[PDB]
């Protein structure tokens, strides 16, 4: 099965476990939440008084630096699309300015129509985590300085447009039909002012000599230069962005390479100012003596801290959404992406998958990792449905006191008198073969992200060592064991009563404390089968003497694990 696992989309590719879609499920909450240095718990910005919306002015020192090993990643590192050929004319002077070294690169960004702030967030932290604050506070920044925005653009922009311009910053507001898929440069001007940082939008060599001002240097004109410096007294090195196509519909960020030379932007590739005097290039950019400017920077945040922050948001995301954002992401890929629709809203996937959470309708494949669901349209159980017809000729009348199990669908349905529908308890419903690869081992997924393993189920956690050969950990009685336990029966006689009971005897555990201890195994059985008998302490001695004589294996490596179908064959 070459195609039994769909290729992971740019929003779904997880770099260091981080995917764009997953970050999209955490970025809007970052707009009013922060990470704690002591507990690691998320904290509302109301308590740490950073405003209701995340102040992006602190992000002026943030420039993404790409590692060489993560360049090849689709959707995270280098974009593989036609923008690679597009910027070569610009890349001719990008490289040669820094002595013929690749210092500034295009970066792939999700094409959901809000890539402009997605790129800017990727320009700042390289993730889709700080983008959502870039718009909502920008709308407020437009409102606060609208009169000063009017001072420049009342003769270039219609007064009624500014009410629509602030509507452009709205997160999920879909503009009316016909609007080109992309945000205007007016946001970047505000964003450059919001970030207390210059922003540079590039184009090809033809783009610069094109008569359009769509490639320009966005300077923080509304913010004075002394406020446009970092905490060290130095001006923030600008983040750079580019046009990703000749149609001008997707934005890309231009970032440096982590550990490599700081990119330098030559004067011919440094575009003119956008809406502000040209002299502001000297005032707002840390300019060099050779006529160029330094791009990127070294005051960047290492990916180690951001990993906590993503985890710091998955914390509250438990309480707020009742579901895990990665669990939402897989539901998106396997059921929403199953329809082939590009651009599905993350919110709909979050809320609807909770229904699968509540009834345990998610059944995850244990071999290829496919997340399968036992989804049944409501009319299939209503009159006229498929399973509605079977109940009549297979088990007679619709009985309120009789449950209808459907082995073909593994649905056990009761008949509710008022609704005249057969109601399967999807907790009792179990997928037996995957609808992606027909793997027999397909198991439920809980809302906390925990998979409902069974006895003999092999978990995805790596085995640190074991005779099993499977290389993965095995799950047992609520615990994770490196190996599967030997089993052999026991024979109990007390008070004349006789019991068959099978004894599972773990051995060769990497951790010493998890190995079986006979004085607990023996006591468990007698208690489990003879609660409250007098003189059972004599029975335990007889039991212990048996197990020891049975586990006395001549060769210590005589390992004959339990025979469980599917896990091992």
């Amino acid at each position: 099965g070459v195609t039994g696992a769909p290729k992971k989309n740019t929003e779904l590719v997880k770099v260091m476990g981080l995917s764009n879609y997953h970050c999209k499920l955490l970025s809007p909450i970052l707009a009013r939440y922060g990470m704690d240095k002591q507990t690691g718990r998320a904290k509302l910005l109301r308590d740490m008084n950073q405003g209701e919306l995340f102040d992006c002015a602190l992000l002026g020192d943030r420039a993404f630096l790409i590692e060489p090993e993560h360049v090849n990643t689709v959707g995270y590192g280098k974009d593989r699309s036609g923008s690679l050929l597009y910027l070569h004319d610009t890349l001719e002077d990008i490289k040669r300015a820094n002595k013929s070294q690749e210092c500034l690169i295009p970066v792939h960004v999700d094409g959901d129509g809000h890539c402009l702030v997605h790129a800017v967030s990727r320009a700042l932290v390289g993730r889709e985590l700080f983008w959502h604050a870039l718009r909502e506070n920008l709308k407020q920044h437009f409102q606060q300085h609208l009169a000063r925005y009017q001072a420049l653009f009342h003769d270039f922009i219609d007064a009624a447009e500014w009410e629509d311009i602030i509507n452009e910053c709205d997160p999920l507001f879909v503009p009316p039909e016909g609007v080109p898929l992309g945000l205007r440069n007016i946001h970047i001007f505000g964003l450059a002012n919001v970030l207390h940082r210059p922003i540079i939008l590039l184009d090809s060599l033809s783009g610069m000599r094109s008569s359009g001002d769509y490639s320009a240097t966005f300077l923080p004109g509304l913010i004075p230069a002394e406020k446009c410096t970092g905490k060290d007294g130095h001006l923030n090195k600008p983040i750079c962005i580019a046009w990703s196509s000749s149609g001008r519909n997707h934005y890309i960020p231009l970032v440096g390479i982590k550990g490599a030379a700081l990119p330098k932007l030559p004067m011919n590739l440094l575009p003119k100012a956008w809406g502000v005097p040209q002299d502001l290039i000297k005032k707002y950019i840390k300019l060099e003596e050779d006529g160029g400017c330094v791009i990127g920077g070294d005051r960047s945040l290492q990916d180690k801290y951001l990993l906590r922050l993503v985890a710091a948001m998955e914390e509250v995301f438990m309480d707020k959404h009742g579901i895990h954002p990665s669990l939402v992401a897989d539901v998106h890929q396997y059921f929403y992406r199953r329809t082939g629709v590009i651009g599905v809203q993350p919110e709909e996937v979050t809320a609807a998958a909770k229904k699968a959470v509540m009834d345990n309708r998610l059944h995850k494949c244990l071999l290829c990792g496919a997340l399968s669901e036992l989804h049944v349209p409501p009319e299939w159980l209503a009159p006229g449905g498929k399973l509605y017809n079977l109940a009549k000729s297979t088990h007679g009348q619709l009985r309120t006191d009789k449950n209808y199990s459907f082995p073909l669908n593994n649905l056990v349905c009761s008949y509710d008198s008022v609704k005249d529908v057969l109601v399967p308890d999807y907790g009792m419903s179990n997928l037996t073969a995957c609808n992606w690869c027909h793997g027999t081992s397909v198991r439920k997924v809980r809302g906390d992200g925990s998979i409902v393993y069974l006895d003999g189920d092999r978990t995805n956690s790596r085995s640190t060592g074991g005779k099993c050969g499977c290389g993965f950990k095995h799950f047992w009685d609520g615990k994770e064991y490196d190996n599967l336990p030997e089993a052999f029966p026991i024979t109990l006689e007390w008070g004349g009563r006789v019991v068959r009971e099978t004894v599972y005897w773990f051995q060769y555990e990497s951790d010493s404390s998890l190995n079986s201890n006979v004085y607990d195994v023996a006591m468990k059985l007698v208690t489990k089968h003879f609660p409250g008998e007098f003189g059972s302490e004599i029975l335990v001695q007889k039991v212990v003497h048996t197990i020891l004589h049975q586990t006395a294996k001549k060769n210590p490596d005589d390992y004959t694990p339990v025979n469980i179908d599917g896990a091992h064959a």
Binding site: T527, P531, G532, F534
Partner: protein
Amino acid sequence: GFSGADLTEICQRACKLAIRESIESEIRRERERQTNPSAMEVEEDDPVPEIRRDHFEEAMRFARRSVSDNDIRKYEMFAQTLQQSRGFGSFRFPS
């Protein structure tokens, strides 16, 4: 669920931990004094006259349970055998 005979252990194993800390410091003091016999520093009254909480905070680490839980629903189930063969309290003299 501690027995009546495993609180007579907690109250003794918390004495050995104050006996031992007494002979220890009694001996260890004579050591340093003989290291500096000219120090002349004398008339030291006592290092530990008292059970001194943070002994019990340590004796509780060796405190076991005699009768396990199953060893209680063995007697408590025997009481409800002597009982449950009674209960005529409904009896009432008429008029």
